Paper text:
Here we describe the discovery and characterisation of endo-acting glycoside hydrolases expressed by mucin-degrading members of the HGM that are able to cleave the O-glycan chains of a range of different animal and human mucins. These O-glycanases display endo-β1,4-galactosidase activity and specifically target the polyLacNAc structures that comprise the main backbone of many mucin glycan chains. All of the GH16 enzymes comprise a β-jellyroll fold, characteristic of the family, consisting of two β-sheets composed of β-strands that form the core fold, which were superimposable with other GH16 structures previously published.
The apo structures of BACCAC_02680, BACCAC_02680E143Q, BACCAC_03717 and Amuc_0724 were obtained to 2.0, 2.1, 2.1 and 2.7 Å, respectively. BF4060 and BACCAC_02680E143Q have four fingers and BACCAC_03717 and Amuc_0724 have five out of six possible fingers that have been observed previously in other GH16 structures. This enzyme possesses four fingers (numbers 1, 3, 5 and 6) that extend towards the cleft, with fingers 1 and 3 sandwiching the negative subsites and fingers 5 and 6 sandwiching the positive subsites. Finger 3 contains the sequence motif for GH16 subfamily 3, which consists of three tryptophans interspaced by other residues. For example, BACCAC_02680 residues W131 and W138 are platforms for the −1 and −2 sugars, respectively.
Author numbering: 34 to 274
Write the structure that this text describes.
């Protein structure tokens, strides 16, 4: 029961322009190097893949990323098949979801199906953010501390999150990794916002290094590792029975 699928096999060199929008600059770790990215120069559809490129163009770091203009309800599972072409030190690829039309971050939550950093190069991270976890200023969220530590992100894997009123279930390659559960506190506490807003799909390969003179989580950029790409074979949203 498929609510949405993109196989990136349209007769087009860019992703569906009604569904996918190019990521824009913001002064944060994942967004700082969308600055000066000229249209689709780091984003194409080729050979059935969405290809998101991270590179240094003439001394400027440039990220590759899109986000979905549509969001999805509860009672659904998001599956994204992707690999990195290459491990890149300073590389910061991600597959994740933001609420559409929620209050200021992180009051509507955030779901990360996949982030990779050089600091733990044989795992990925699956993470949840809420106002109840992060408060005003926090940015760590709650992450799967028992994440697979013997994992090769440069092979194809299916990253998934099943979102219901009761819980988020995380999977890698169809295998459950962890659960973030509704505690059913007063709504006032903002502990489980995940069914009050549609959630979109964000696919990016970003570059880390320092943000305002402070080392980001993905850490130092090694220019000799660039360029790198994330290849997304498909995204689908399944409606649960
Ligand atoms: Ca494909």
């Amino acid at each position: 029961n498929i609510l949405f699928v993109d196989d990136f096999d349209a007769k087009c060199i860019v992703p569906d322009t009604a569904i996918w929008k190019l990521c824009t600059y913001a002064n944060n770790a994942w967004s700082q190097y969308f600055r000066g990215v000229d249209g689709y120069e780091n984003v194409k559809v080729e050979e059935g893949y969405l290809k998101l490129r991270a590179c240094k163009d003439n001394g400027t770091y440039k990220n590759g990323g899109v986000f979905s203009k549509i969001g999805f309800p509860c009672g659904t599972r998001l599956e994204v098949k992707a690999r990195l072409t290459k491990l890149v030190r300073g590389g910061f690829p991600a597959i994740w979801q933001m609420p559409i039309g929620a209050p200021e971050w992180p009051r509507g939550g955030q779901i990360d199906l996949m982030e990779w950093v050089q600091g733990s190069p044989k795992q990925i991270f699956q993470t949840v953010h809420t106002f109840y976890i992060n408060g005003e200023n926090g940015s760590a969220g709650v992450t799967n501390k028992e994440a697979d530590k013997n994992f090769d992100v440069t092979k194809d894997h299916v990253y998934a999150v099943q979102r219901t009123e009761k819980e988020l279930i995380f999977y890698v390659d169809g295998k459950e990794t962890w659960k973030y559960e509704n505690q059913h506190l007063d709504k006032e506490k903002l502990q489980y916002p995940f069914c009050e807003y549609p959630f979109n799909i964000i696919l990016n390969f970003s570059l880390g290094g320092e943000l305002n003179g402070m080392m980001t989580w993905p850490g130092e950029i090694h220019d000799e590792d660039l360029p790198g790409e994330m290849w997304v074979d498909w995204v689908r949203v399944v409606l649960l029975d």
